[PDB]
């Protein structure tokens, strides 16, 4: 009673997965076959064995009989089961199996030929006494044949709900069909099947006139069918099992088989398609996949799956079994409601609407219905995207700064919340942030809208519309928001908010990390965003709280009028003379700063006076005197990346390697969200208390929404002079209890710094113990404590505990920390593949040479700099990377759990420096060395300042699908160990793809780091260690420190042409990178002409219409103002 020992599936997707469940249950070994895009699919995983066919297309792989038959040969499969599609109804193939001693689980090549031609099929039907055609339904009969003249009708299905002939919903039993006519569909089907000596499963389709009560032969499908599961629900038969048993001549005894149909059952087909744009296939990575577990769902997808446009966009078949038609229709609606699939556009909403219709319920179904079905998405549609339009929410992705997950959310949080409030949204509603110029949107449903923020002209069906007022939108309406004239950004709110899944607590988009928002990115031409109409929705979005209302005008923020701004900050952490000269601190607050073309949500870069440093270098943390033992920064901090500063904003870095001078006050950050290149700013010192006042005034303004409650910067709010950021110093007491320095670090945090400016492993354990002391006292008011190398940043809620109070608890819990030199900690050991100096790492330096700084003591090659400043061979550097034991000291250096690690061997600690200024771009998985520290850049496209050395795999698993035992996206924890092992660039790209699909087995072992054992290891090597240390710096390192400190050059300061040229202008201000085309090249419409760097992005300015490149205006290094002429095409 085992038909076959091993069976191959000549198929992919959902049918392959379903055939395999049966095979498994039957104890039959299964064999997968896959194309190249399918190498990661469920059916390949589920099988006992598998054979790569090589190639991409249907024809190259699944359809190539030769390959298939070789595949079954190679694995010793006694049988091939084909599914449907592909070689399923291909008779040469059925015949090849036969002529090869492989049993084709299907009918004979002859029967397939006899049924393939529209007219041979008609004769058989006639001879079989099947009524033929001498508002149409589609009723089909599922039949089984034993290949020896016996045939049995298993039931009928209605498949009327078809769109341009493609089935979407099927059901059984057929509704509104009398027994007289069902029993005679059955018997006709059995005659047809008998006459053929039909073998295995086939379907006889009929046309049915419901009114006339008549049916007519349409065709036989000589195979199993996609909708077969509804039949299985009502009979309890496993049709694949039957096929297998029949195909091996161990058929069920047909004359004695009693089939009972029990209840009613319905199936909906979930496709990766867009119903709003013509059912156009929608490829991409599924980001979250949830199905009702109580329905039967035949699928091949889960969180993680990459859905391609190649084969057929089926995702899942959702199958429900009810007591009767009405029970099943309700079940199906619940199932559809409970189906959450995100990452691709689906037809779920289209399905929901159909499953829900009065039509479907009254059973007024016909092969024609779906072709004139009124489908309206409760949603908008992007007719044009705008330069950078993102779904955001507020406060954003909070909870995870210690990991280096930024909050994201709106860059100007005040306007954002006004916009929300104006429409009466709960404050958690998501909205769109428009940057520089907005989208044009088509609304498919009705709602209220508002726009707030910068000055932008806004259109509804072409009539100007007011900002800060609730505008009523109709359906067919086109809202359009143009260029931002004053400020950078505006906010478009929609009553009820926008419907997008949360990631890590928030619907905010973090584009760098492909996280959150509308599928991890800015909006695109063609996107379709869903709203939350309470009557037409099943949504978890928070319902509005308030009736809409124009914002009182006294509550509007005062944007600058003339590209010039005063911006309030709290002094600290590092605006003190241990780091900067006195006069430089004065100049910092006295002079104006100009906003630099490289500014974006990661941070806003500034041009102004160059620093005078109090130290000659930064020692072990890097030579440049701004370099600091990596510590966690504050939102709003003004970070000195070498000799130039940048304001850390809501998509910004967290654990970082440079000093911060001051921090924009929480409530002042909105200003920074409205800066545009060329703006001037001046930082204005502000006391902790004043900073709280502004903030609280914004909350009251938003909460009550009442004239006069907004406070803003004014002279009597401003400190006379910058103050000292050092809040208190505890003196050093003993070896394990170092000095403690408490620095004010923003409106929201106190930075605690241990020791002298120096690394010491004990201090890392100590930070762990401080954190533990706060948990033990369960202190009220503390928001998040973030570990750095020798510091921890403590975020508080000023409405729960004030600055002074938190300082004193901290000073006090500090004396409660007790531990000895012999401590231990759980430590995970990661062994990670790394390519030395591969192409993507080197190209990162190249881009830095050609876009920012082309000469520097650490250029042209970073490894050579490490080698040279340390007096070793480059291969000595390579050797240490592959023998060092890197202990993670903190996360988010920089972004998504990017580690800051330090070799456990002191002889592995090399002098170095961090870039001056930092890069704007780094490749995912790049490994860096910053002074003596090591990092892995977990995110693609991140600013970075470490010396680049090679590349591993990201230690951030966004969807937690990797093959490892870690339960969240950040794979590392402080005190873990990373070791590198050598692979080739190409071997690394294999691993990278494999790991992105969860098919790479990360080498991780749980263990324990023991400081007692470690201190003993230092002893048996103390000699070598000391020799190494005494001989490290010198005059050579000092010349380097001198050279490293030279500020980069100031950017550059910024005739007749043929009569009907295309003149080409850059939209943005940026520095000219490189040309794309050569003068005299032919270009098409769209083709690139030149490249700019603007806003940390590689900006292609391209040809409008086709032509020849007549002139290209700039060379590498030129500044280009927005609206400047950049090329001419003739
Ligand atoms: C735009 O370039 C914003 C950059 C913010 C500062 C960058 S992030 C990585 C470097 N490390 C660091 O501590 N600051 C630099
Ligand atoms: Na605050």
Task: Report the strand count.
Answer: 59
Structural class: alpha+beta
CATH topology of the largest domain: D-amino Acid Aminotransferase, Chain A, domain 1
What's the CATH H-level homologous superfamily of the largest domain? ATP-grasp fold, B domain
What is the CATH top level name of the largest domain?
Alpha Beta
Bound molecules: 5-(hexahydro-2-OXO-1H-thieno[3,4-D]imidazol-6-yl)pentanal, sodium ion
Number of domains: 7
Overall shape: globular
Count of discrete alpha- or pi-helical segments spanning 4 or more residues: 25
> What percent of residues are in strands?
25-35%
**Helix fraction bin:** 10-25%
* Largest beta-sheet characterization: 10 strands, antiparallel
Distance between the termini: 79 Å
Please give the CATH architecture of the largest domain: 2-Layer Sandwich
PDB class: ligase
Keywords: Carboxylase, ligase
Assembly: monomeric
Entry title: Crystal structure of the Kluyveromyces lactis Urea Carboxylase
């Amino acid at each position: 009673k085992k038909p076959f020992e091993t069976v191959l599936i000549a198929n992919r997707g959902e049918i392959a997965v379903r055939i395999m469940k049966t095979l498994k249950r039957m104890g039959i070994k299964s064999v997968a076959v896959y194309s190249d895009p399918d190498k990661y699919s469920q059916h390949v995983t589920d099988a006992d064995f598998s054979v790569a066919l090589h190639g991409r297309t249907a024809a190259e792989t699944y359809l190539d009989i030769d390959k298939i038959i070789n595949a079954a040969k190679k694995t010793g499969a006694q049988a091939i089961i084909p599914g449907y599609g592909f070689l399923s109804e291909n008779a040469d193939f059925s015949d090849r199996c036969s002529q090869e001693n492989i049993v084709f689980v299907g009918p004979s090549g002859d029967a397939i030929r006899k049924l393939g031609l529209k007219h041979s099929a008609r004769e058989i039907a006639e001879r079989a006494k099947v009524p033929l055609v001498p508002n149409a339904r589609h009723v089909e009969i599922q039949m089984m044949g034993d290949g020896f003249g016996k045939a049995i009708a298993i039931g009928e299905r209605d498949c009327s709900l078809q769109r341009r002939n493609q089935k979407v919903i099927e059901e059984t039993p057929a509704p509104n069909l009398p027994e007289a006519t069902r029993a005679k569909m059955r018997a006709a089907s059995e005659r047809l099947g008998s006459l053929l000596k039909y073998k295995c499963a086939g379907t006889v389709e009929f046309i049915y006139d419901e009114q006339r009560d008549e049916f007519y032969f349409l065709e036989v499908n000589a195979r199993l069918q996609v909708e077969h599961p509804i039949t299985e629900m009502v009979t309890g038969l496993d049709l694949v099992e039957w096929m297998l048993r029949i195909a091996a001549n161990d058929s069920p005894d047909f004359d004695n088989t009693k089939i009972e149909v029990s209840g009613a059952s319905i199936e909906a087909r979930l496709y990766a398609e867009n119903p709003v744009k013509d059912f156009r296939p929608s490829p991409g990575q599924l980001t979250s996949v949830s199905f009702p577990s109580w329905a039967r769902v035949d699928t091949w997808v889960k969180k993680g799956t990459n859905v391609s446009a190649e084969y057929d966009p089926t995702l899942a078949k959702i199958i429900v079994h009810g007591k009767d038609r009405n029970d099943a229709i309700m079940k199906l609606n619940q199932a559809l409601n409970e189906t959450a699939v995100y990452g691709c556009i689906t037809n779920i909403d289209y399905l929901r609407s159909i499953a829900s219709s009065k039509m479907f319920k009254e059973a007024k179904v016909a092969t024609k219905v779906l072709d004139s079905f009124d489908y309206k998405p409760c949603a908008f549609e992007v007719l044009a995207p705008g330069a950078n339009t993102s779904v955001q929410d507020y406060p954003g992705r909070t909870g995870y700064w210690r990991i280096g997950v930024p909050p994201s959310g709106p860059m100007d949080s005040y306007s954002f919340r006004l916009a929300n409030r104006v429409v009466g949204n709960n404050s958690k509603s998501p909205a769109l942030e428009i940057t520089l110029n907005g989208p044009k949107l088509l609304f498919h449903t009705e709602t209220v809208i508002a726009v707030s923020g910068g000055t932008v002209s806004c259109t509804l069906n072409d009539a100007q519309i007011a900002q800060n007022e609730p505008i009523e939108v109709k359906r067919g309406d086109i809202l359009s928001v143009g260029k931002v004239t004053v400020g950078c950004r505006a906010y478009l709110s929609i009553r009820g908010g926008i419907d997008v899944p949360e990631y890590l607590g928030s619907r905010s988009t973090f584009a760098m990390g492909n996280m959150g928002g509308y599928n991890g990115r800015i909006l695109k031409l063609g996107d379709v965003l869903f709203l939350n109409q309470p009557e037409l929705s099943v949504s978890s979005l928070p319902a509005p709280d308030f009736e809409p209302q124009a914002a009182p005008k006294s509550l509007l923020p005062t944007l600058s009028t003339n590209k010039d701004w005063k911006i309030g900050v709290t002094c600290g952490p590092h605006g003190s003379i241990d780091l900067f000269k006195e006069e430089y601190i004065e100049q910092f607050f006295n002079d104006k700063w100009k906003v630099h073309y490289n500014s974006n949500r990661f941070g806003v870069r500034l041009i102004g006076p160059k620093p005078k440093w109090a130290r000659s270098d930064g020692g072990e943390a890097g030579l440049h005197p701004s370099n600091a033992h990596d510590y966690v920064y504050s939102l709003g901090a003004i970070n000195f990346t070498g000799d130039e500063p940048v304001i850390i904003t809501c998509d910004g870095p967290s654990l970082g390697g440079f000093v911060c001078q001051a921090v924009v006050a929480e409530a002042e950050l909105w200003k920074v969200g409205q800066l545009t290149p060329g703006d001037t700013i001046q930082f204005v010192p502000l006391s902790y208390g004043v900073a709280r006042q502004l903030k609280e005034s914004q909350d009251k303004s938003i909460d009550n929404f009442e004239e006069g409650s907004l406070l803003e910067l004014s002279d009597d709010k401003i400190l006379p002079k910058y103050e000292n950021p050092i809040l208190a110093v505890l003196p050093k007491k003993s070896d394990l209890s170092p000095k403690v320095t408490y620095r004010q670090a923003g409106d929201r945090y106190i930075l605690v710094e241990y020791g002298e400016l120096e690394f010491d492993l004990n201090i890392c354990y100590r930070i762990n113990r401080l954190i533990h002391q706060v948990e033990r006292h369960q202190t009220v008011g503390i928001v998040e404590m973030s570990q750095g190398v020798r510091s921890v940043l403590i975020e508080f809620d000023g409405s729960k505990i004030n600055q002074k109070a938190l300082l004193k608890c901290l000073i006090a819990y500090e004396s409660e920390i007790q531990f000895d030199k012999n401590w231990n900690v759980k430590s995970k050991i990661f062994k990670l593949p790394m390519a030395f100096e591969d192409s993507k790492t080197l190209d990162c330096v190249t881009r830095y040479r050609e876009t920012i700084r082309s000469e520097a003591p650490w250029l042209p090659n970073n490894v050579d700099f490490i080698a040279d400043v340390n007096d070793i061979d480059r291969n000595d550097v390579k050797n240490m990377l592959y023998s060092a034991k890197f202990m993670v000291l903190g996360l988010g250096d920089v972004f998504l759990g990017s580690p800051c690690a330090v070799p456990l061997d002191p002889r592995h600690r090399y002098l170095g420096t961090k870039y001056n200024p930092s890069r704007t771009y780094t490749a995912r998985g790049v490994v860096g060395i910053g002074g003596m520290y090591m990092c892995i850049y977990n995110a693609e496209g991140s600013p970075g300042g470490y010396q680049l050395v090679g590349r591993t795999i990201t230690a951030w698993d966004k969807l937690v699908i990797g093959d490892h035992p870690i339960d969240h996206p950040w794979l590392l924890t402080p005190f873990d160990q990373v070791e590198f092992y050598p692979v080739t660039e190409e071997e690394l790209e294999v691993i990278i793809e494999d790991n992105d699909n969860g098919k790479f087995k990360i080498d991780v072992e749980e263990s324990i780091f023991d400081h007692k054992e470690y201190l003993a290891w230092i002893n048996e090597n103390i000699d070598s260690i000391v020799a190494f240390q005494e001989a490290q710096g010198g005059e050579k390192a000092d010349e380097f420190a001198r050279l490293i400190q030279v500020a980069n050059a100031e950017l550059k300061k910024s005739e007749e042409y043929p009569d009907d040229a295309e003149l080409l202008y850059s939209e943005y201000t940026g520095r000219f990178w490189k040309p794309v085309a050569a003068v005299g090249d032919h270009v098409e419409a769209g083709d690139g002409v030149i490249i700019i760097e603007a806003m940390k992005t590689e900006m292609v300015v391209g040809a409008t219409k086709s032509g020849k490149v007549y002139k290209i205006l700039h060379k590498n290094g030129d500044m280009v103002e927005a609206g400047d002429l950049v090329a001419v095409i003739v």
